[PDB]
Amino acid sequence: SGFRKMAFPSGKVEGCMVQVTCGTTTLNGLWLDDVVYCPRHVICNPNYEDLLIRKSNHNFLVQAGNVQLRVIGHSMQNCVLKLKVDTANPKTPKYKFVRIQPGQTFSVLACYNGSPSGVYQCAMRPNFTIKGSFLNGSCGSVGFNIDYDCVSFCYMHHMELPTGVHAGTDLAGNFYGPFVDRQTAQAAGTDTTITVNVLAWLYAAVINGDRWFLNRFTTTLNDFNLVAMKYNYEPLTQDHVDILGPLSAQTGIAVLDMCASLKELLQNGMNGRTILGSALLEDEFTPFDVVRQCSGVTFQ
Amino acid sequence: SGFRKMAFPSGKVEGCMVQVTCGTTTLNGLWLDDVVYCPRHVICNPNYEDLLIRKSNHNFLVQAGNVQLRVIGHSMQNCVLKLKVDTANPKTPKYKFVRIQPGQTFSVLACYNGSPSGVYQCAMRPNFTIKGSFLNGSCGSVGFNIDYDCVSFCYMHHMELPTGVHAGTDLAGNFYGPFVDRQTAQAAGTDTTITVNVLAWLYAAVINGDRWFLNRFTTTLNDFNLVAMKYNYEPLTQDHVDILGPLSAQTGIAVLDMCASLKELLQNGMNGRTILGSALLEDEFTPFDVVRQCSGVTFQ
Numbered sequence A, B: 001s002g003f004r005k006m007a008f009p010s011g012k013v014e015g016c017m018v019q020v021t022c023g024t025t026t027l028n029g030l031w032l033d034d035v036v037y038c039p040r041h042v043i044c045n046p047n048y049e050d051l052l053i054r055k056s057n058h059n060f061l062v063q064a065g066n067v068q069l070r071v072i073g074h075s076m077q078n079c080v081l082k083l084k085v086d087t088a089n090p091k092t093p094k095y096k097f098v099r100i101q102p103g104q105t106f107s108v109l110a111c112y113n114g115s116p117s118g119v120y121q122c123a124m125r126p127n128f129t130i131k132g133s134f135l136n137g138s139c140g141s142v143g144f145n146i147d148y149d150c151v152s153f154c155y156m157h158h159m160e161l162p163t164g165v166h167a168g169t170d171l172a173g174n175f176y177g178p179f180v181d182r183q184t185a186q187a188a189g190t191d192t193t194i195t196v197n198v199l200a201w202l203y204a205a206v207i208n209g210d211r212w213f214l215n216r217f218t219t220t221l222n223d224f225n226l227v228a229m230k231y232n233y234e235p236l237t238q239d240h241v242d243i244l245g246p247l248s249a250q251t252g253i254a255v256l257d258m259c260a261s262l263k264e265l266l267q268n269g270m271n272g273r274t275i276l277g278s279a280l281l282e283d284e285f286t287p288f289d290v291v292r293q294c295s296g297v298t299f300q
């Protein structure tokens, strides 16, 4: 038992990170097959693709450790550079590129100079930012989930907004949210709490022996949603309730009783008590995250 | 910027996890060179020396993916079994076996049937437990730190105590804390807060822009101590103050002044405010961890 913020194991992603140097800018790249994916602003109100046509293949130093990968061709797909190199990465996992939805979580392998520094779990916030940990040179670090043996890359890091939150793209180069890879003013937008995740985390708490917050008040999805709007919570939908099925069925607490639990926590606070070692309602565990961890799902 | 609970990348440990089955008991083992380390209760108020002498090398199916490893010897060092096998692990990294002190952190690569499930950080609490995430079948999972390219193995899991906390050994088989690997009633003992860690996380907060908790008050080492023991915080030594020097100089906040901040936080609480997104005072970040995350250090 116990419950912790758990990342995927990152060896499948570690074996892909490369350093991409161009001019006096260095950042990270993702080497899959004979392609290196990286943020286009390594070539830097830019006209990126005017700036790209003025580039040559030999202008791009790609270093997989202490071995120089040589670029045989390049193209730009939205906000990512794709660098065609002369070597297939023999450590290329089975992979896909996916675009995650907000509320969904993923592991970030933060890198600098091609080298993995640490791994941690993030959620895509409702305002299309992530609360990451990223310094100068961490761009090109990827987020990912694993299913069985296949890596689903969902995030690549590009920028930090003034409120200390982070913004990036999928591996197709399209930003999450209304951000651009340009050093002009832009703000994260107001965030909201991922309600379905909070409820998932309360189930996890029950599955682990935290029941002090429970009651047997019930509620309707409509009455609950009136309260969710009052406290800056995302609306709860019947689809959310459905995904919460397995969790409810394992604990014996109907979704709508646990929603009534959430409501009393929202109106009365937690009153000096902690849930799973936290004094706040945690919203970065999906239902799938709860089920995987509380049942020991592993990955080949 | 940002500060999140960050694990070492796990791929060097991933290449060393195997499945160890004996009788009907399966748990995880660590395969370095031609030796597989695992919890000794895999051969299970027993008598382990008697139980071991009754075992043959063929009783141990050590299973590495789809490559059965032939056992060709065995021995018991305290609570760990050492299974010499006929193949040296080609993916053996540079490694060390270290016994860590309380307050020190490490990453845990939770595993099941020799397959990684996730990675996360933990601290050796002062009562020699850890607050992990471990189910049936997770024994043999290791805790570790990474330095340049060297894996310092420091923990191997064995058991969960009734409070939901977790107990284990170093890789020389010696338990942390008074605990024994048998189904005899044993409780964790009273835990305390790692004061030096809380102060380091206060600095992380400062480096990341949370200053609301600071003040111009100051204190003596003993006066702040007089307060820590009131609140179950552990003594702060002058050795700890020294270790906080780098953080003190980078922020220009003297440690005894940060102690004054923490003192005020202990006597008044957080009163609705968060620090680094927590409403409790976090103690599972060492000064190391802060400097490494807030400066970006990597691992080849």
Ligand SMILES: *[C@H](O)[C@H](C[C@@H]1CCNC1=O)NC(=O)[C@H](CC(C)(C)C)NC(=O)[C@@H](NC(=O)OCc1ccccc1)C1CC1
Pocket: A027, A041, A044, A134, A135, A136, A137, A138, A139, A140, A158, A159, A160, A161, A162, A166, A181, A182, A183, A184, A185, A186, B001
């Ligand atoms: C890639 O290594 C870095 C990562 C940044 C640096 C520290 N933390 C990070 O996540 N990315 C950048 O340096 C980008 C470069 C561009 C903009 C993608 C070309 N710059 C930023 O992250 C800057 N953010 C920014 O420009 O956001 C909009 C903004 C808001 C207010 C005033 C001006 C601009 C920020 C580091 C300076």
Ligand SMILES: *[C@H](O)[C@H](C[C@@H]1CCNC1=O)NC(=O)[C@H](CC(C)(C)C)NC(=O)[C@@H](NC(=O)OCc1ccccc1)C1CC1
Pocket: A001, B027, B041, B134, B135, B136, B137, B138, B139, B140, B157, B158, B159, B160, B161, B162, B166, B180, B181, B182, B183, B184, B185, B186, B187
């Ligand atoms: C190895 O896979 C497991 C890991 C445990 C299982 C659940 N979570 C974990 O971290 N280890 C065990 O099953 C041990 C086996 C021994 C005792 C180490 C040989 N058993 C336990 O963890 C059990 N706890 C226990 O025996 O603690 C002492 C105790 C306390 C109170 C009353 C009696 C005994 C418990 C999981 C079943």
